[PDB]
């Protein structure tokens, strides 16, 4: 039994330093912010503003000259200049207290550089996989973190880098420092821990900068996840329209009313009455038929794929329910 994963969005603010760089970024190209350029201009200018705002929402020290001037010192301000670092400082402190180990994912390898200095400044043992790490080295980092009685506590990874199907079930908590445009890259990052072999409840903390760009980024990726799940559940609707008729289906069509046909010594239902007609009788037919039509349409148009799908055992015709 594998326990379903808990996913919690941690909406976070920005330090005064972040606000400064956030304004500085918007001011550098404020005419693009106001949407004053022509519709012909490339996406490049807007995409650049987007990435710099993500760097600002992650940590100000991603920009050169941001961190206070020389001499450069690792300090407490490495934590108190970024809204996520403050939330992370206490979140990790509480994670280590309850005996939980944590994987931390990020989009940017320069941010894991900042987290490396934080881990030593706080005394945390850790591993790290960037995607610039070779095949054999990241194997040792996996096994080191997975070792029975391991010394490590935090695992630093970039969202895409691990590969596919790696096992980090020795950790129980996943911290997404920042999210991906592709919701499947992040879900693959959560499933590093939430997969067969995990015995404890997997909890995923997705850091989100509230009232900023990352809040609107969250909704665009949430829709993409929802739109994805809709394609997936209809993946068998392709076959159903394509599928030809069963031996079970053809048999049911022919047998429909076959007994009453064999019983009829005269004529079938409608023609039993007259067979010549009164416009009252024809207007009675159309009214009765329109009633049956509306019932049929409303009955089927509310169905989904799970009601119209034919299992493959349908064409595995064995015997008759009761004989004909």
């Amino acid at each position: 039994s594998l326990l379903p994963k808990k996913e919690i969005n941690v909406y976070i603010g920005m330090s005064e330093m972040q606000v400064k760089w956030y304004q500085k970024i918007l001011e550098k190209d404020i005419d693009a912010v106001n949407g004053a350029g022509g519709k012909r201009e490339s996406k490049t200018r807007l995409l650049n503003i987007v990435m710099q705002l993500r760097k600002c929402c992650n940590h100000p020290y991603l920009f050169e000259g941001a961190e206070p001037g020389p001499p450069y010192t690792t300090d407490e301000h490495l934590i108190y200049n970024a809204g996520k670092m403050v939330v992370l400082d206490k979140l990790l402190k509480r994670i280590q207290k309850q005996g939980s180990r944590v994987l931390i994912f990020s989009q940017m390898s320069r941010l894991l550089d900042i987290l490396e200095d934080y881990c030593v400044f706080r005394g945390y043992k850790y591993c790290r996989i960037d995607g610039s790490t070779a095949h054999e080295d990241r194997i040792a980092a996996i096994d080191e973190y997975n070792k029975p009685g391991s010394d490590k506590f935090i695992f630093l990874l970039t969202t895409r880098a691990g590969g596919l199907g790696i096992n980090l079930t020795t950790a129980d908590i996943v911290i997404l420092y920042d999210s991906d445009w592709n919701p499947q890259a992040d879900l693959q990052a959560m499933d590093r821990a939430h997969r067969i072999g995990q015995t404890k409840q997997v909890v995923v903390y997705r850091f989100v900068t509230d009232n900023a760009i990352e809040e609107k980024v969250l909704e665009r990726a949430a829709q993409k996840l929802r739109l994805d799940q809709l394609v997936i559940q209809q993946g068998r609707a392709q076959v159903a329209a394509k599928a030809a008729a069963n031996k079970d289906e053809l048999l049911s069509m022919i047998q429909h009313g076959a007994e009453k046909v064999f019983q009829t010594k005269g004529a079938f239902g409608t023609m039993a009455e007259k067979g010549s007609l009164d416009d009252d009788d024809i207007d009675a037919i159309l009214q009765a038929g329109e009633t049956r039509t509306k019932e049929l349409n409303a009955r089927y148009e509310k169905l989904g794929i799970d009601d119209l799908q034919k299992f493959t055992s349908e064409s595995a015709y064995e015997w008759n329910g009761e004989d004909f």
């Binding site: 450069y72 320069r110 550089d113 900042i114």
Partner: peptide
């Protein structure tokens, strides 16, 4: 020194 450099 520090990794963020």
């Amino acid at each position: 020194g520090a990794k963020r450099h």
